[PDB]
Design an enzyme around this catalytic site. Sequence first.
Site, mmCIF file in Angstrom:
data_model
loop_
_atom_site.group_PDB
_atom_site.id
_atom_site.type_symbol
_atom_site.label_atom_id
_atom_site.label_comp_id
_atom_site.label_asym_id
_atom_site.label_seq_id
_atom_site.Cartn_x
_atom_site.Cartn_y
_atom_site.Cartn_z
ATOM 1 N N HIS A 114 0.487 -0.475 -5.408
ATOM 2 C CA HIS A 114 -0.753 -0.209 -4.892
ATOM 3 C C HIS A 114 -1.132 0.932 -5.006
ATOM 4 O O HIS A 114 -2.460 1.430 -4.437
ATOM 5 C CB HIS A 114 -0.668 -1.027 -3.551
ATOM 6 C CG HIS A 114 -0.234 -0.223 -2.353
ATOM 7 N ND1 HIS A 114 0.714 -0.747 -1.687
ATOM 8 C CD2 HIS A 114 -0.288 1.044 -1.754
ATOM 9 C CE1 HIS A 114 1.204 0.343 -0.601
ATOM 10 N NE2 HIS A 114 0.565 1.272 -0.928
ATOM 11 N N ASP A 119 8.009 -4.522 1.211
ATOM 12 C CA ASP A 119 7.673 -5.744 2.182
ATOM 13 C C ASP A 119 6.306 -6.014 1.943
ATOM 14 O O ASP A 119 5.557 -6.921 2.279
ATOM 15 C CB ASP A 119 7.706 -5.438 3.633
ATOM 16 C CG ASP A 119 7.374 -4.223 4.377
ATOM 17 O OD1 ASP A 119 6.458 -3.383 3.810
ATOM 18 O OD2 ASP A 119 7.552 -4.112 5.519
ATOM 19 N N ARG A 127 3.898 -8.365 8.174
ATOM 20 C CA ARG A 127 4.121 -8.464 6.754
ATOM 21 C C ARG A 127 5.215 -9.452 6.083
ATOM 22 O O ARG A 127 4.935 -10.329 5.104
ATOM 23 C CB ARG A 127 4.544 -6.944 6.082
ATOM 24 C CG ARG A 127 3.564 -5.951 6.216
ATOM 25 C CD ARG A 127 3.791 -4.696 5.406
ATOM 26 N NE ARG A 127 2.785 -3.744 5.658
ATOM 27 C CZ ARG A 127 3.127 -2.406 5.262
ATOM 28 N NH1 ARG A 127 4.122 -2.012 4.472
ATOM 29 N NH2 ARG A 127 1.957 -1.409 5.226
ATOM 30 N N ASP A 170 13.443 6.317 -4.247
ATOM 31 C CA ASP A 170 13.332 5.580 -5.685
ATOM 32 C C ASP A 170 13.433 6.792 -6.599
ATOM 33 O O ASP A 170 13.942 6.549 -7.882
ATOM 34 C CB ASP A 170 11.919 5.090 -5.855
ATOM 35 C CG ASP A 170 10.555 6.038 -5.282
ATOM 36 O OD1 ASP A 170 11.034 7.149 -4.789
ATOM 37 O OD2 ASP A 170 9.551 5.933 -5.173
#
EC number: 2.4.1.222
Length: 243
Positions: free
Chosen positions: A181, A87, A21, A157
Amino acid sequence: ELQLGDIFIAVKTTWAFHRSRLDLLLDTWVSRIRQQTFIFTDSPDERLQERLGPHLVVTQCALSCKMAAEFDAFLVSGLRWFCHVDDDNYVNPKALLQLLKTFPQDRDVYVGKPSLFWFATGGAGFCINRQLALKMVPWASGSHFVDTSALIRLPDDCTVGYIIECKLGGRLQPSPLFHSHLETLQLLGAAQLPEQVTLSYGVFEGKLNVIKLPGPFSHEEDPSRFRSLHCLLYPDTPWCPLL
Ligand SMILES: [K+]
């Protein structure tokens, strides 16, 4: 009068993803904004150390130990804006600066893509200004003179949103320009794509979720579409192909 130099971009990674990544991000968006970008990982790396020097932060580990590392590093920096990404995120720094200029300069701000208390989904990226971040310190550091019982079983988060909404009386400002995503990314095509602040790639509900671009790289050469996006945004880049 806000500039790019006012922004601290933190990227969270791990050793097992350095090759898969991180190399991709270094080739693409990190190459356009290296001076403001700091990569937080958990093992040394010769290749990344070569390309990043002190911009590679190897941690030896309320918030998780890497996220605490990102907050601490941001505050040490003194910069006005903190933006967290993962990432598997792409960042458009031009779109990012334009959005950030839109807020009154002396108000607290937390901006991102809302999810349910409201919180900015970490996989979409989110930004906080220094004045709000300094108010978060007692909770974010797990200090012994605030109540963090609620903080210990929340993800990073969520914890960030809880502190801001529930402890500080602030509010998430939603923006349609941040993308995870966990979103049907195929609604974003060449026309919408340049106005977006973040994009993503990954598997969710059994589907590989990516932006909609025909090229210039094939899906086999560029499964994330991040090389193709990068070439749309910066077509002067020598390694960009025709398609
Ligand atoms: K937590």
